[PDB]
Design a protein around this ligand. Structure first.
Ligand code: DTP
Ligand code: DTP
Ligand code: DTP
Ligand code: DTP
Ligand code: MG
Ligand code: MG
Ligand code: NA
Ligand code: NA
Lengths: 481, 481, 481, 481
């Protein structure tokens, strides 16, 4: 039949097995063509027009590359073609659950629209995968190419979301444990999904990538660590791994957490919230769902993409006026205004349940400056951003196993001081951005005074531009000089 | 003010004048974010997710680069800042008139939906530009930055569409004639729009570009040719100019005229035709327009983007069933089947008014093979493609002026035989692709027999796979050996 | 053992089998570090610092890629690991015979220094390979890794130089015929050596490469053609193959035949000729050789690299004064002056044995202008350059075999008219460059008059700048208008 | 006059002022074609064939870019074309002083050959520049283009080496202080030399660069800081500046301090030391100089390049046997063996004058294992490497001035806690590599035991492979856990 060839600008010419083609040529997978990888990021980086679809192809490709390379170097692992196909399918399908504008949907909209429910793209991907399989008669195709659907569907879902409940997985046994480290690596965060987005996002954003995934593959091996088979890196590659996470952090600082990209995501979310009572999406049995409830029905969710943005923008319904107007403001670039950024000092850390009280706190600050306008809580947005190396406070290199040239089957551990004094001492921090919904010059001036006063009151760090934006407030603080 | 800086993956960090920002931050310009540069090509090249918006920024940037470079080298041209801004604005806005899926709209849909009307993206761009200016109070902003709206609006439109009726232009006089060669060069086709799409399309398609626009700029000069000031290239760069057009032709062969991309464009066009009576788009004064009539009202046209595809795909109306079903077949990748490709021999050239007669001709061919299914005219699609070097049958290098190192103010001509014997003897040709709407094995086999027989009957070239797909037909033709 | 891994900027991370490492770590191979790929080109393109060593690694790598790919797709070919190693070794070693400044040595110096002898880099490579094997005890290492030295040494040499004299090869039989098409393809010129230098030269020159060798590999198959197994390309890739040779021609026009790079090569050759009686190189048994006789003894030739240039430049011997002075003039950029370029028309073609008569012919021309300086034959240099598609007058695509999607084991042929009307009508031409050794403005003016007059007298093409450089000469010629 | 245009693979098409061309076309500048940028690095990274010449062109080009950009944005700085040319010349000429194999010469050879003298490439560059000017009649050419030689030669030398003896410079006054921050920035290390080598080294090494110099230029301004005009960065670019130094550190870890590249540099240095009594280089007045004394005479130093390596390698003099043999071992890849790497803990820091005592210390360690070979001090090499952010222990961002968007003429300071907790806590460290000159298996095993024992005895960090290479030694140390 067909090994189809696909030309990808990041990976070049990729071969797709006919079973992968069958999965790809479905409304559930093709849907990813209409969901932007970086959401609101496109509105700041005009190169970032790329969608989840092409990222998914790349993830499936790299998953295949890594499992093949391991199998060629270590025939004793007994990786079968069936294993390779299952890993490729998981790599291909791990983005199926994303919603309009990607992280905006799961990171901002759903938590506000449906605070009671716990929703992740991972869960969505498993549900959509099930829907894809059942709606398109995939199971007989899997059997035709040597898969065993019961075991292998389970294995694929487990790769995506983790244990579907002592060895906790049912899709494959402990001697194939390393296969769970490829698509979504919950142990240390080194997975093929990161490798594709590093390369792809960089190519589109116009920022250059310093991580070499092909080198890592060449140096990768499977070793026994604590009775378990794990993918291990060559010892001397440790520096490269530190750099990989540094790259990830840089991408988040420069692009994914860009202050204006975040505010555009915030405005789109607001628009969706105001549209939520009036947009109807037809799901299974002709039932109607909302933007916020399409996650409950996969048939409906299949039709929930970036197009919602344009449905609202182009609407004529008076009911959608408020939602439509917010999107129109985005088009005119009448954005909420960035006021500034600060961080907590020392051990002190800000709990999630306090986020809603923060705009009130800013509005309550009493700056000794003459102000013609005074602002209220609702005029402020406070966006708290948790930046880490993927494992909260932990160093993921403490969770990585290495091997040495002289004994390639012997796994070892490497600690931070065995590497460099010039590495991060901490692996998590919080950034606090403040914005003002009132966009006029007088309001922005006032907002800067409240903000810097609030920072001083909370003993947060001095904003970078603090002496310029609030010259009358910054002298009060001793610690700021 | 101060400039905005925009990071573009092709051009890096670009400066935008505040007037350009004002023009960009409008619904008329932001619309271009929702129109794919390569239309159906995305469905073949997954990297080609890029939209007309980012291309437009690039064109505006390069227009500025060229006019600046000329002014720095030749102060005697008297290029003013006003001229630079007008050239940038034209470059920025020359894509405003594109419709859903770009060339699909003006190349396929409108000629079928509205055969009586003459429509071009150029005309559309002028109409949209006027609408953009008038709807957003741009004229006072132009005066603020030293533009004279009456003259300069005229100049910008003329750059986009050409003479609005010897010297035929009103926006600038003959001593600034060279300025009309930058954004859309009607004399020879060497303009900045090509330079951006060569680099941008290549970056996204995953194909590399051989043309160096920065070299060309470095060697560009303005000289008097026939009492007119024109942009001239250095003599020895002639090979590079031939190569530029070769690059353009290669991009068309490999990507823009890809056989499956074209059939996807064809299917989308069919879907739009079937949807045309039922999709309603609200224009000026609340009036309703169709997909095919939105070009008559710019307010309506502003809201006509790629989104139409998703509106149809997600529709529930039984009236839209036929349109919706076509798009669903695209998603399942049930595409019309490629039968093959042929070309005319010699003097024979196929007129546009004969395109409709061609499917009938294929169905009329009488292959001497026993056939279980016979096919009708409507089961065939015949797609005729005109490939040239941008000036129909002419060599555009015959319309280029050069200068020599020893006399940089003296314009000269170079003929083909002064360059190389290894160049094309002709500069235009036609490709004929045939597809079959019936997708089953028996029908496809039959379609191949009719096709090859038709080629033989018309003394078209032997299809490349002719001996394999029609082993019983190919021996009859003497000419094919 | 395990592989060494080498990071190459063109190909990334390359694995080298330990036998290849043994071959590489020898004075005969390491020698290639001291020989510039593009010779005098470095003096025009400052990026072109790259040497034959890294090019050789790339060729060996790509040879391995192609043979592996073929073997994986078609197990029935019976490609063994022994075959893969032999192909890699041939790819690695096919550059061993190059001399100082690469093509300058075999293309310019040796034919002038030793007109009686017939010498090629290919012959040199075979001799050096033999010397490498024998001097470094490689044969037992070959046996250790499963090679059979007698048969396999023969096979490797045959890949490099062709038949060492009905099936003409002894290293492998007709059922492995396709293996001879990989490293140096005598049938059509599509080999891995071209693919490495396209990518590498482009990377260093600062000119971008439009040929995708990875796509070619993906579409390559072995089919029976006229009782012989040959590498065949997919039908629809024919355009890409035409483009590959177009790319080669463009690299020669822009870079390898750069007019000043050629004149620098010419000057270096002159310097070597003047140094040849006095530089001594110690060879086998302590015998002394000349630059021109080092090719007779491999031990001596091992020590003959670009260093010769610096030995001359840094010399103090009065005997080397004339040679040294030429090189000093190169450093001051006192080069021979470019006068112009022309080509023959029609039947006329210029034979190698006429090259020496050409400067006399230019000096003999009688331009009707009063001239204050007159020049002699020795003041002129005439450089004749043969540009073709690698097979003299032939179209190498007439020597390529293809397959179609519907019958992948069935080889077919494709003619020029089955492809495009926009292709070259001829596949060979000659370029004639004229230079003047007298650099002053009066002499250069005179040289231009003689040159254009000579062109007219011989009915050569009109020089591009002819109307500017010789305004009194060009009107006499009818055919120039 | 008109510019020469040069095509550079990093920067594309560069314009060179005719005075720059005059400087470039001299034996003193052309010499840099024969000195490899990365020295022994080429023997590890085969892409790193690049020489100091092309790097110098790039530095001159970027120096020009930065000074032009500042002048265009801030006309009030009064930057003249004279200033631009002087900055370009300094940028062009700041690499003139490098010796064979670049850092090997000043970093390893001269300190061992001539411990009494203090020599730097900077000092060498000033001396060579003076020699270049005087030997080639450059001063009249400078006057012709509007330079004032006395003042401007002084200015150029000051940019290269710093104050030639309160404002300490004589070439320009305090109101042009910012001009001293461009070519070699002693205040904070942000200069154009780094920018060129980041891009160029990465391009050739096959490692990707994450620093965007064009972005920095776009955001750069000159502001008053402490009565002095200095180049300032936009506040929010601070992360990018931290990253610039991170990039520099990564290039040193991965490439410039590569353990095998360093040992090759060490072996070449040993060969030069053994050759030093016998190589003669003819300098001014026919006087003879040694490799170690050519730095005393510029005429001699002009002829001291990488060629020395080949002169030794190809020599027949019995006196050069020992030097020649070392180079031959490099060719066979019989290198000294890497034993391992460690670092000091805490306060402990190792002074340069202690380096000689270190091999003795390793040999003195008493590992409690029966060993069949014992090794002596001369069998060990200990290489101590100082890694910092360019300012020893200091954070160079503490020496950078920033501006904010709302007050672009007001300079501010940013402290480390105002940026991120995820940054380095220390900015300097030492790496200690140990190698063994005895290459046999028994000796290497013994060397590993001495090494790890020494680490334990000195409370240095545990070697990464310590548990594998010295399983009997590592358990004794408490702190290694
Ligand atoms: N000449 C080319 N260079 C680079 N990419 C190309 C070229 N031609 C096509 N592609 C891209 C488009 C697709 O992403 C991928 C496969 O295209 P192509 O090989 O034409 O497949 P196809 O499915 O249309 O052909 P068939 O089914 O006839 O093999 O390569
Ligand atoms: N660190 C970075 N590297 C590359 N591109 C970046 C980086 N940071 C932002 N960009 C991109 C996004 C935009 O396309 C362009 C400008 O962004 P940026 O300088 O952040 O503008 P801004 O409008 O957010 O800043 P302000 O208005 O504060 O000057 O640069
Ligand atoms: N961090 C890196 N990134 C990219 N290339 C590198 C890196 N470090 C080294 N290289 C290059 C240098 C060589 O071209 C190739 C192999 O280097 P490296 O793996 O360090 O080999 P090695 O021979 O020194 O290690 P060992 O023998 O200890 O495995 O990759
Ligand atoms: N077609 C090309 N594409 C890219 N770079 C080129 C090309 N031709 C030449 N170069 C490079 C080589 C040099 O680095 C730089 C200048 O080359 P070129 O323009 O041919 O200078 P030149 O000095 O020979 O011409 P002249 O003196 O006749 O103007 O550009
Ligand atoms: Mg995106
Ligand atoms: Mg597109
Ligand atoms: Na693509
Ligand atoms: Na180098």
């Amino acid at each position: 039949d067909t090994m189809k060839v696909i030309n990808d600008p990041i990976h070049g010419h990729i071969e797709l097995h006919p079973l992968l083609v069958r999965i790809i040529d479905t409304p559930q997978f093709q849907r990813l063509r209409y969901i932007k990888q970086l959401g609101g990021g496109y509105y700041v980086f005009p190169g970032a027009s790329h969608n989840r679809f092409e990222h998914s192809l790349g993830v499936g490709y790299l998953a295949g590359c890594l499992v093949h390379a391991l199998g060629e170097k270590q025939p004793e692992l007994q990786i079968s073609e069936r294993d390779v196909l299952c890993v490729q399918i998981a790599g291909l399908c791990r983005n199926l659950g994303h919603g309009p504008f990607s992280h905006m949907f799961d990171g901002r909209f759903i938590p506000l629209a449906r605070p009671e429910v716990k929703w992740t793209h991972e869960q969505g991907s498993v549900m959509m995968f099930e829907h894809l399989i059942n709606s398109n008669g995939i199971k007989p195709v899997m059997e035709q190419y040597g898969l065993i659907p019961e075991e292998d569907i389970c294995f694929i879902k487990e790769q995506i979301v983790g244990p579907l409940e002592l060895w906790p997985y049912k899709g494959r046994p402990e001697n194939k444990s390393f296969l769970y480290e490829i698509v979504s690596n919950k142990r240390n965060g080194i997975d093929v999904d990161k490798w594709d987005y590093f390369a792809r996002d960089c190519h589109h954003l116009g920022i250059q990538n310093n991580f070499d995934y092909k080198r890592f593959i060449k140096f990768a091996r499977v070793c026994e660590v604590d009775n378990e088979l794990r993918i291990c890196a060559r010892d001397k590659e440790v520096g490269n791994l530190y750099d990989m996470f540094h790259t990830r952090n840089s991408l988040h600082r420069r692009a994914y957490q860009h202050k204006v990209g975040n505010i555009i995501d915030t405005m789109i979310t607001d628009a969706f919230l105001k549209a939520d009572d009036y947009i109807e999406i037809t799901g299974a049995g002709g039932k109607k769902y909302r933007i916020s409830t399409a996650i409950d029905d996969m048939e409906a969710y299949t039709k929930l993409t970036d197009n919602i943005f344009l449905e609202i923008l182009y609407s004529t319904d008076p009911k959608l006026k408020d939602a439509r107007e917010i999107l129109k403001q985005i088009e005119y670039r009448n954005l909420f205004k960035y006021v500034g950024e600060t961080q907590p000092t020392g051990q002190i850390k800000i709990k999630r349940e306090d986020y809603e009280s923060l705009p009130k706190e800013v509005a309550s600050a009493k700056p000794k400056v003459l102000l013609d306008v005074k602002l209220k809580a609702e005029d402020f947005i406070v966006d708290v951003i948790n930046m880490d190396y993927g494992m909260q406070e932990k160093n993921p290199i403490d969770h990585v196993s290495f091997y040495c040239k002289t004994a390639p089957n012997r796994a070892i551990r490497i600690t931070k001081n065995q590497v460099s004094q010039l590495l991060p001492e901490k692996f998590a921090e919080q950034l606090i951005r403040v914005y003002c919904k009132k966009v006029d010059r007088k309001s922005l001036y006032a907002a800067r005074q409240y903000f810097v006063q609030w920072c001083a009151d909370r003993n947060f760090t001095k904003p970078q531009d603090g002496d310029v934006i609030a010259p009358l407030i910054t002298p009060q603080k001793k610690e700021w000089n």
